[PDB]
Amino acid sequence: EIPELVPVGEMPRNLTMTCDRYLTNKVIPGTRVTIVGIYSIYNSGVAIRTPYIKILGIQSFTEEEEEEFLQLSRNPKLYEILTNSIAPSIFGNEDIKKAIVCLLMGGSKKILPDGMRLRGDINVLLLGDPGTAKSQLLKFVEKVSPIAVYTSGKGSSAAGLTASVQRDPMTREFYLEGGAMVLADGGVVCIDEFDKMRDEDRVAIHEAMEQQTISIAKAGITTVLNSRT
DNA sequence: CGATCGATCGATCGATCGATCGATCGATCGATCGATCGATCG
Ligand SMILES: Nc1ncnc2c1ncn2[C@@H]1O[C@H](COP(=O)(O)OP(=O)(O)O)[C@@H](O)[C@H]1O
Structure with a gap:
């Protein structure tokens, strides 16, 4: 499920799906999709059967809302109103807003x-003195960006941030698995204490920042994955 | 009318500080090792 819809203190639930013939290879990790399928289980706890989905069809605003937002575009003070609207609890700071x-x-x-x-x-x-609401500025973006991921520099790793390769215990095969910087594809990520993360994590960020790609070379397999983060 | 003695100038040694380089010891991040438990195929 979407992490934005997940309340804090919870890891999003993961569900295994299977597709065949023309429905294969349409979506890569990190792609948001709409699912039409069959809910079922299959054996793979005492009797804990692993749920799985037979995929049947995958897809990947109101008229009054369009007029409402078009009217917002037609507002003469639209830029300043939205500028003030960003973190209204804080004072001044117009430029950074x-x-x-x-x-x-x-x-x-x-x-x-x-x-x-x-x-x-x-x-x-953000490269200024402590106690200037710089941490609060990142937090507000997490609540306004539809695709938002927030993570600290200390509690992150290159494998956790970028993509990784891990074996799925359900099908006993090695899968390519995305990371935090892969989930935030097509949106905004908020990293804090950016100075405190290791250089290897920074190096992987360099490829994402300047090429929107992540290259994975682990065990004996190599691959490149896009990340518009 | 010469005489006593008080006060300052420059040579000149020396001693006290500044600074630069070089040697030495401690604080610290990275490479390495171990372990345990999962599956894979022999
Ligand atoms: N201009 C401001 N208006 C309102 N609150 C502010 C402003 N500047 C700082 N703050 C206060 O500072 C706090 C956020 O500081 P933060 O960015 O977390 O510090 P740090 O930079 O050490 O992370 C908030 O509690 C906020 O109330």
């Missing part, structure tokens, strides 16, 4: 004629 607003929208994607892609994400570093 406005940059974070730019973070929410992000840039527009462009593709070179040679096939390369320009990174559209806007990444901002």
